[PDB]
Design a protein around this ligand. Structure first.
Ligand code: SF4
Ligand SMILES: [Ca+2]
Ligand SMILES: [Ca+2]
Length: 1118
DNA sequence: TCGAATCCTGGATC
DNA sequence: TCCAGGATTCGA
């Protein structure tokens, strides 16, 4: 043990050595200082007793650039529950058995929601243990746990213990829960003296943040063609980085042919990017220079793109090959999980954010796309085959490109990432890098821990999984879930305001609507505006206008008119449903508990009942067969799980793995006795939601909603003030206002993120508070509101798309759109009401809203007040200029989430179910799809619209038919060459065949087995015609031949084509033109020609066929 | 004997 | 985590 003690002392002094090297002095004598808290880590530290105790370090910074550490001791503790009344005796045993390890043992009561009648006000006692250091927590936990399990299964001193809680919350999270310390607050701290603990006080007085120094860097390398770079053979060729708006470029002068000299590269006036240049004799000097410059400038935040996965290891290895050990110089080291970390400097990252939080569509996560979308400029791109060629022949081009990764990533990080992470971190205890790396579901739980602590409620355990659970009829389940909602495109076609369409609508629906018109607007005034009608003079005039319009619609229900395109959606519908229904993760009970609760008496109104749908997939075998298989596995002993030990009885093996053995043996049996692979069943259930259970969760959600709207209000105010400051042009005031604007906007984005996270936690596996019921009841209710909405609209008009959060709709031009009301209250001189929204809002107010909410009046009397509430509230959008949907090639199948939309300006408002870039798709489709949508806006009637957009396809088709005769072949290659790359060794497949594989075998044949050796072969192929009839996995030809010497080409082509008599080899002879013309067909048929036949227009492109089902349906309908 | 279903592989650094 | 594309497997 002493060897571990001295090892952890060694690492402690090593960290303090680094901190002194990076200027983080300690506090050493009594005094007070004010500082901003940037980071914290746990550490073991000595005290006056020379014992070793667990502690936490806090790192503070000051406006003057000074920095300091402080450290605080704190003792872990965890709770245990004895059998009734045994507390003293068991505590006497614990104190006897673990004297010298237990720091203290104590009795305390707690609130515990599962306790019978607990709402009457009962409580239970728990013992609290505590220890001098986190190791003894482990040692005691490991010894107590099995007695806990034994006593659980069976139901002496350990036999008395019954339950145990709260033994796995991280120690440094524990400390921030208990002592209310969060980072990016300002603090004042008093060191009273080494005899005494420090004391820390919040200073919310100070709002303005300091500026940390930030460093961003990237490296570029040699590598062999068609391969990933090799840490053992390749050499770093240059490294480039930004510090706080300044750029430096270090060149490995051995390779780069010329002495680079300084230059400037600005993407835009907002991005200056001046750059300074250094030349170093060789890679060892470049790495020395960089390790010197970092240790000089002492950066505090490092930032990099994907840097954990590629960029760090390549530096670490080459430094080690020169003996310049990374970890001693900078400090960065690989953690247990595989992330590079350091004690004094935080490794921020982008791609974790681009994934988790940035709302960007899949496959557009490439840096260059993110630069286009959020930064809005054209980065430069160059084919990684050429790197060495430029280095030999044209260095300035390689510099010019290679700086443009740094100048992009630094500004992206500063502008978008930095105020988001340091906003979100203000409300969570975890460290910044945990908050970035950790999955968002865990943040919701950590946040809920704070409230559960302040409410004095003891945590539940993590949810235990069951093995091979059974239905009552003994079907072993394989899957179980709530019935999810659905997405469906109802119709396909092209819709635009300019193009009249035919409508049919039921007149009786209008004779219902016109009865309620005043009531409708009254509601919009009374509930939504909170401006009583008595504050308006002309309320009657617009009501009679509306009634005249409704009458004019009623007179002629079937008509042709221009369309109005509206989008209807509900903001944050699921939180609103939670707030409305008082759903909580512990509100459910079985009726067996209301049998106990004294509040169960005649005419009580605490029971709310609601319904949800459940789905299961399970095997047909029943209780006998499963129990017989279990007895089979008991009667015959297993082999050892692997042949490194003796045979095992069933009690001597991993139970969870035995669950897989049982599953496999059932799957092997079933086909003898039964004749179905899966049975899938759906069912509907209802559950009593206790309406006056403790409320802290809903109170949290409501608080977050209200704070969200507060910060939106302040952001609007500060944006106006910023416009005023920028008009004035006073640089200090401009700075102050812009700082406030960023701080408020980041805070509102952070709360938006948390709010959206509050739903996604409840379904998570293993999480502390969990119930699929609450996940189901919300989701099923989220369908009724949408279905009843269409149950209205489909009588008025036509819905085009139905989606999880809203619908897309089209209404006759004659419909009442919006109005303004002449207020008397000059506080708000005019109000505008959108009638199509207000007409919907009252429906959901009437049907859905809760009228049996309850709230506590008095803790000593438990008098309760009944109430009603609602917050479900539709929002309207647009109206939009145009919308387009595709159609499926196959009959009888429905698209999802795939369409385009255009705003009244004519610019794209949306384009979804597609993307403008992919690494796995050939160029021709990408160009074609882009050009067709931009053409669809042209023309003025449907026959003109299709007559115009046909002109792109009838271009490309003749490009192919004319063999691209006039096109340069370099363009031809770029137009038709696929792309792929292999992430595995060829040995790891054994045998299988696909086009992605065959090219690698052929490249090996061409270059030798050098290509085989490892993962990361990059390959480019085209599909040949000549070997007729074989599957397409055969005919793939790698491009690299066509660069090679003629006779070598002839020799290998005659082989792979199986033609000893071909006498031409120019690519035009070889290409299987028919394949490409077909696959372009398989795109055009999904956009232009099927929809037109589905929208009463004759085929606009005769050179491509319809499928036979449509051809017959056309003939039979004609 | 043909059609429907199943499973496989990649994207994200260079 | 999600979809396209291709081939094999399974059923009438
Ligand atoms: S709903 Fe009423 S009777 Fe049922 S457990 Fe809750 S408080 Fe008791
Ligand atoms: Ca790069
Ligand atoms: Ca990189």
């Amino acid at each position: 043990s002493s060897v571990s003690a001295l090892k952890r002392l060694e690492r402690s002094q090593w960290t303090d050595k680094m901190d002194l090297r990076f200027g983080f002095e300690r506090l050493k004598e009594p005094g007070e200082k004010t500082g901003w808290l940037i980071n914290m880590h746990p550490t073991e530290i000595l005290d006056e007793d020379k014992r070793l105790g667990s502690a936490v370090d806090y790192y503070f910074i000051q406006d003057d650039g000074s920095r300091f550490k402080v450290a605080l001791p704190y003792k872990p503790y965890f709770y245990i529950a004895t059998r009734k009344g045994c507390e003293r005796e068991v505590s006497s045993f614990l104190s006897k058995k673990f004297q010298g390890k237990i720091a203290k043992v104590e009795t305390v009561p707690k609130e515990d929601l599962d306790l019978p009648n607990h709402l009457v006000g009962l409580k239970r006692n728990y013992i609290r243990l505590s220890f001098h250091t986190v190791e003894d927590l482990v040692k005691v936990r490991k010894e107590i746990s099995p007695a806990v399990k034994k006593n659980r299964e069976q139901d002496d001193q350990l036999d008395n213990i019954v339950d145990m809680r709260e033994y796995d919350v991280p120690y440094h999270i524990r400390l921030s829960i208990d002592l209310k310390i969060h980072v990016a607050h300002w603090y004042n701290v008093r060191y009273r003296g080494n005899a005494f603990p420090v004391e820390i006080t919040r200073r919310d007085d100070l709002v303005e943040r300091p500026d940390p120094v930030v460093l961003a860097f990237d490296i570029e390398t040699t590598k062999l063609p068609l391969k990933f770079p090799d840490a053992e053979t390749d050499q770093i060729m240059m490294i480039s980085y930004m510090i706080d708006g300044q750029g430096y470029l270090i060149t490995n002068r051995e390779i780069v042919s010329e002495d680079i000299e300084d230059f400037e590269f600005t993407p835009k006036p907002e991005y200056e990017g001046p750059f300074c240049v250094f030349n170093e004799p060789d890679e060892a000097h470049l790495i020395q220079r960089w390790f010197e410059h970092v240790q000089e400038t002492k950066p505090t935040i490092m930032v990099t793109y994907n840097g954990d996965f590629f960029d760090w290891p390549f530096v670490e290895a080459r430094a080690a090959v020169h003996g310049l050990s990374m970890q001693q110089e900078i400090g960065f080291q690989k953690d247990s999980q595989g992330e590079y970390k350091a004690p004094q400097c935080i490794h921020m990252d982008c791609l974790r954010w681009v994934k988790r939080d940035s709302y960007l569509p899949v496959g557009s996560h490439n840096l260059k796309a993110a630069a286009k979308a959020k930064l809005g400029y054209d980065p430069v791109e160059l084919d990684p085959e050429d790197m060495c060629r430029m280095a030999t022949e044209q260095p300035q081009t390689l510099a010019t490109y290679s700086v443009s990764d740094a100048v992009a990533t630094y500004y992206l990080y500063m502008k978008y990432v930095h105020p988001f992470i340091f906003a979100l971190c203000t409300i969570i205890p975890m460290e910044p890098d945990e908050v970035l790396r950790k999955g968002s579901g865990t943040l919701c739980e950590a946040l809920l821990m704070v409230q559960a602590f302040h409410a004095n409620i003891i945590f539940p355990n993590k949810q235990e999984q069951e093995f091979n659970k059974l239905t009552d009829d003994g079907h072993v389940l394989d899957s179980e879930t709530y019935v999810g909602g659905h997405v469906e495109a109802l119709e396909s076609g092209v819709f635009r305001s300019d193009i009249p369409c035919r409508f049919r609508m039921n007149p009786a629906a209008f004779d219902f609507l016109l009865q309620r018109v005043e009531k409708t607007l009254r509601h919009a005034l009374e509930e939504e505006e909170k401006v009583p009608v008595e504050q308006v003079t002309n309320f009657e005039e617009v009501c009679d206008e509306i009634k005249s319009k409704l009458a004019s619609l009623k007179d002629v229900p079937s008509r042709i008119e221009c369309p109005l395109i509206y989008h209807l959606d509900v903001g944050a519908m699921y939180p609103n449903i939670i707030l409305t229904n008082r759903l909580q993760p512990s509100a459910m009970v079985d009726e067996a508990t209301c049998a106990a609760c004294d509040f169960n008496k005649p005419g009580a109104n605490c029971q709310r009942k609601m319904a949800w749908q459940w789905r299961g997939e399970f095997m047909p075998a029943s209780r006998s067969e499963y129990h017989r298989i279990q007895h089979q596995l008991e009667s015959e002993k297993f082999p050892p799980l692997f042949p490194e030990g003796p045979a095992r009885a069933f009690h001597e093996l991993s139970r969870e793995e035995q669950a897989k053995y049982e599953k496999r043996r059932l799957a092997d049996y079933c086909r003898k006795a039964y004749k179905k692979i899966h049975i899938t069943k759906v069912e509907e259930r209802l559950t009593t939601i206790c309406q006056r259970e403790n409320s802290f969760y809903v109170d949290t959600v409501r608080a977050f909603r209200d704070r969200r709207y507060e910060f939106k209000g302040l952001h609007k105010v500060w944006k106006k003030k910023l416009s005023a400051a920028v008009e004035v042009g006073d640089a200090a005031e401009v700075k102050r206002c812009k700082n406030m604007e960023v701080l408020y906007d980041s805070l509102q984005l952070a709360h938006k993120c948390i709010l959206n996270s509050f739903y996604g936690y409840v379904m998570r596996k293993g999480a502390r508070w969990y119930s699929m019921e609450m996940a189901g009841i919300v989701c099923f209710t989220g369908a009724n509101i949408i279905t009843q909405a269409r149950e209205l609209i489909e009588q008025i008009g036509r819905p085009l798309e139905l989606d999880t959060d809203g619908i897309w709709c089209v209404l006759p031009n004659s419909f009442p759109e919006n109005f303004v009301f002449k207020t008397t209250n000059v506080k708000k001189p005019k109000v505008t009401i959108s009638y199509p929204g207000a007409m919907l809002n009252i429906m959901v107010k009437e049907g859905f809203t809760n009228d049996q909410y309850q709230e506590l009046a008095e803790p000593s009397s438990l008098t309760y007040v009944t109430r009603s509430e609602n917050s479900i509230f539709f929002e309207v959008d647009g109206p939009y200029l145009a919308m387009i949907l595709p159609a499926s090639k196959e009959e009888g199948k429905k698209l999802k989430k795939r369409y385009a939309v255009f705003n009244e300006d004519g610019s794209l408002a949306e384009l979804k179910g597609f993307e403008v870039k992919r690494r796995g798709e050939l160029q021709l489709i990408k160009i074609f799809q882009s050009s067709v949508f931009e053409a669809f806006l042209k023309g003025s009637t449907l026959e003109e619209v299709y007559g115009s957009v046909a002109k792109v396809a009838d271009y490309w088709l003749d490009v192919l038919y004319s063999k691209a005769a006039n096109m340069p072949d370099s363009e031809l290659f770029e137009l038709i060459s696929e792309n792929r790359s292999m992430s595995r060794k060829l040995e790891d497949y054994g045998e299988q065949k696909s086009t992605s594989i065959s090219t690698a075998k052929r490249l090996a044949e061409f270059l030798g087995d050098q290509m085989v050796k490892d993962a990361g072969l990059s390959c480019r192929y085209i599909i040949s015609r000549k070997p007729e009839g074989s599957p397409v996995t055969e005919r793939a030809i790698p491009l690299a031949i066509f660069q090679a010497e003629p006779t070598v080409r002839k020799h290998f082509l005659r082989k792979w084509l199986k033609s000893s008599s071909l006498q031409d080899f120019d690519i035009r002879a070889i290409l299987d033109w028919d394949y490409y013309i077909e696959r372009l067909g398989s795109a055009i048929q999904k956009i232009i020609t099927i929809p037109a036949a589905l929208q009463q227009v004759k085929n606009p492109v005769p050179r491509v066929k319809h499928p036979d089902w449509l051809h017959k349906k056309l003939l039979e309908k004609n």
